[PDB]
């Protein structure tokens, strides 16, 4: 029934210096095709969330060092979560970059928020917010400390990096389920 995921095959034991790493974090880029598929096609993200406990979420950290808009996007994601519209704006940023490729500038990212009822003035106000800035720095700092080198990249307890290609290849639904199973297998691992 329950698979015995193997170190080396399904995941690697990373070494971080981070004192309090997210229990579960997915490093991603709105420019990354597989990152989009994980959030909208394969639905690896919903699969994982559907199986997590109430006192724990899938944290998504945007990679600023990827592409021209990288930084503006890490900021937009931070504002997105502060405004709590991170659930709606996610698909619109992926589309704006990989479907319609109509997001070319920082001013174009703001236009997405406008369509949700967030004026350019409110967006500017949020860009300044102390919590927004703290989350932007957290995202950038962990990409460095965790030594991220690809997206989408999942890390459990800041010690186990999942090997995306190692999971069930039958179809995407099975793959997503296998990923959530592996994530759980890692969260339930001895301290």
Contact 59, 26 (CB under 8 A): yes
- CATH number for the domain spanning 168: value is 3.40.30.10
Q: Any bridge partners for residue 7, and if so which?
A: 11
Q: Choose among 88, 102, 65, 66: nearest CA to 77.
A: 88
The stretches of the chain forming alpha helices (DSSP H) are: 33-36, 44-51, 70-82, 86-94, 106-114, 120-128, 130-145, 172-187
CB 24 within 8 A of CB 183: yes
- Output the CA torsion 47→41→71→59 (10° steps): 0
- Residue written as tokens 């096609």? 41
Domain enclosing residue 35, as ranges? 1-191
Q: How far is the CA of 86 from the CAs of 13, 54, 93, 116, in angstroms?
A: 30, 18, 10, 11
* Dist CA 113 CA 127 (whole Å): 12
**Cα end-to-end distance, the chain, whole Å:** 24
Q: Is 83 helix (H, G, I), strand (E, B) or coil?
A: coil
Q: Which residues are CB-contacts of 8 (< 8 A; sequence separation ≥ 6)? A: none
User: Could you count the other beta carbons within 10 Å of the beta carbon of residue 17?
Assistant: 8
Q: Go through 165-190 and write b for each residue having 16 or more CB atoms within 10 A of its CB, e for each that does not.
A: ebbbeeeeeebbbbbbbbbbbbbeee
- Across the beta sheet with 160-162, the strand order is 11-13, 160-162, 153-156, 24-28, 59-62
Torsion from C-alpha of 105, 109, 111, 116, nearest 10 degrees:
170
- Which residues are registered as beta bridge partners of 123? none
Contact assessment for residue 32 and residue 153, using Cβ atoms and an 8 Å cutoff: no
Concatenate the DSSP letters of all residues of 16-28 into one string.
---SS--SEEEEE
User: Cβ neighbours of residue 162 under 8 Å, at least 6 residues apart?
Assistant: 10, 11, 153, 154, 155, 156, 179, 182, 183, 186
3 state DSSP class of 188 = coil
Q: Report angle CA 77, 90, 158 to the nearest 5 degrees.
A: 60
Query: How was this structure obtained?
Result: X-ray
Say how many domains are in the chain.
1
CB 14 within 8 A of CB 21: no
What are the structure tokens assigned to 28, written together?
A: 């991603």
């Amino acid at each position: 029934n329950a698979k015995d995921y193997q170190a080396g095959k399904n995941f690697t034991v990373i070494h971080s210096t981070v004192k309090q790493p997210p229990p579960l974090v997915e490093f991603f880029s709105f420019y990354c095709g597989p990152c989009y598929a994980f959030a909208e096609r394969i639905n690896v993200d919903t699969a994982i969330r559907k199986r997590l406990p109430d006192d724990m979420k899938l944290e998504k950290y945007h990679v600023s060092q990827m592409g021209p808009l990288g930084p503006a996007l890490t900021e937009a994601w931070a504002v997105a979560q502060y405004a709590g519209v991170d659930g709606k704006v996610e698909k619109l940023l992926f589309e704006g970059l990989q479907v319609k490729r109509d997001i070319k500038t920082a001013a174009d990212i703001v236009k997405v928020f406008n369509q949700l009822g967030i004026t350019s003035e409110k967006y500017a106000e949020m860009q300044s917010n102390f919590m927004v800035k703290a989350l932007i720095a957290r995202q950038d700092n962990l990409v460095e400390k965790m030594k991220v080198h690809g997206t989408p990249s999942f890390y459990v307890s800041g010690k186990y990096h999942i090997n995306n290609a190692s999971l069930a290849q039958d179809d995407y639904d099975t793959y997503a389920e296998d990923m959530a199973n592996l994530v759980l297998f890692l969260l339930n691992k001895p301290l």
